[PDB]
Ligand binder design. Structure first.
Ligand SMILES: CSc1ccc(/C=C2/C(C)=C(CC(=O)O)c3cc(F)ccc32)cc1
Ligand SMILES: CSc1ccc(/C=C2\C(C)=C(CC(=O)O)c3cc(F)ccc32)cc1
Length: 264
C-alpha cells in the first residue's frame, strides 16, 4: 500500500505546481538571495509605498490602508480560484455531492490561504505582487486602527508554521487534508469525505516521515497547527465586521461575501 500512498503524494504535488503560480520554493529563493530569482522592492514607510506604486507592476485615490485592504481582496479572490482548481484534482472530490463540494470550499479556502501565505512571510514582512514587492511587518502594524491589526496574527502564525520547514510537496498533501474535513457545518454525507481524508492523512504521514526523517512527530506537530488556523479566521471575520460598519462605501468582493455568509 506504500506505493499507492507515494503515487498519491506525487499526484497532489504535480497538481499543486500546476495550480499555484508562486510556490514556497520560489518565495524562499526571493527572500533569501538566490540568483535563480530576482530581488523585490521593499515597502517600509509611507514614502516608499508611493515609490512602489510606480516601481511595482500591480495586477489590479483613497486612503493608504484602504488601498491595501482592497489589494488583499483581489489576491484573495485569485487564491480562491487557485484553491478551487486544486480541489478538483484531489481524487474523489468532484464525485462528492455538489452541496458538500461548495461547503468544503467555503470553509477551507481561508485556512489554506493563511497556510500558503506563511510561505510568503518571514518575521520581517511578506511578499506581494507575485513576489515583486515586499511589505514590512512593522509598516503594516502602524496603519491606522483597526487596519493595522489585520496582519499581525498572520505573521505570528507564519513564524510558528515556518519553523516546521515544510516544502511544497508536504504542503500539497496538507492543504488537501484541510479541504477534505468531514467536520464542516452543514455537510450532507460526512462518510465519503472522511474516507478520502483518511487516505490523504496516511499519504501526508508517510510523506513527512520520508521527507523529514530526522524531524520527530512532524505529523502530529503539523496537525495541531489547525488550532492556530481557525483562530486566525475567527479574528479576521471579527475585524471585517468592524470595517463593514465603519466604511459604508466599501463592500467585500461578491465571491468573498458568499464565502463569509453564514460562516459558522
Ligand atoms: C492595513 S493592513 C491590511 C488590512 C486589511 C486587510 C484585509 C484583508 C481582506 C479584506 C482579505 C480578504 C479575505 O478575508 O478573504 C484578506 C486576506 C488575507 F490573507 C489577509 C488580509 C486580508 C489586509 C491588510
Ligand atoms: C498601487 S497602491 C498599493 C496598494 C496596496 C498594496 C498592497 C498589497 C497588495 C497589492 C497585495 C496583493 C498581492 O500580494 O499580490 C498584498 C498582499 C498582502 F498580504 C499584503 C499587502 C498587499 C501595494 C500597493
Amino acid at each position: 500500500e506504500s506505493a499507492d500512498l507515494r503515487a498519491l503524494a506525487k499526484h497532489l504535488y504535480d497538481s499543486y505546481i500546476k495550480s499555484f503560480p508562486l510556490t514556497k520554493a520560489k518565495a524562499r529563493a526571493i527572500l533569501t538571495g538566490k540568483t535563480t530569482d530576482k530581488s523585490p522592492f521593499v515597502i517600509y514607510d509611507m514614502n516608499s509605498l508611493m515609490m512602489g506604486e510606480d516601481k511595482i507592476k500591480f495586477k489590479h485615490s483613497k486612503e493608504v490602508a484602504i488601498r491595501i485592504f482592497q489589494g488583499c481582496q483581489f489576491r484573495s479572490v485569485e487564491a480562491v480560484q487557485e484553491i478551487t482548481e486544486y480541489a478538483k484534482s484531489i481524487p474523489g472530490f468532484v464525485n462528492l455531492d455538489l452541496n458538500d463540494q461548495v461547503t468544503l470550499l467555503k470553509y477551507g479556502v481561508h485556512e489554506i490561504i493563511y497556510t500558503m501565505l506563511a510561505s510568503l512571510m518571514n518575521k520581517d514582512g511578506v511578499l506581494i505582487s507575485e513576489g515583486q514587492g515586499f511589505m514590512t511587518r512593522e509598516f503594516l502594524k502602524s496603519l491606522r486602527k483597526p487596519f493595522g491589526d489585520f496582519m499581525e496574527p498572520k505573521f505570528e502564525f507564519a513564524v510558528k508554521f515556518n519553523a516546521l520547514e515544510l516544502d511544497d510537496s508536504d504542503l500539497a498533501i496538507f492543504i488537501a487534508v484541510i479541504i477534505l474535513s468531514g467536520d464542516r457545518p452543514g455537510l450532507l454525507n460526512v462518510k465519503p469525505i472522511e474516507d478520502i481524508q483518511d487516505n490523504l492523512l496516511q499519504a501526508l504521514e508517510l510523506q513527512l516521515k520520508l521527507n523529514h526523517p530526522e524531524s520527530s512527530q512532524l505529523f502530529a506537530k503539523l496537525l495541531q497547527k489547525m488550532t492556530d488556523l481557525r483562530q486566525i479566521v475567527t479574528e479576521h471575520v471579527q475585524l471585517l465586521q468592524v470595517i463593514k460598519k465603519t466604511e459604508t462605501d466599501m463592500s467585500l468582493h461578491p465571491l468573498l461575501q458568499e464565502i463569509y455568509k453564514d460562516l459558522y
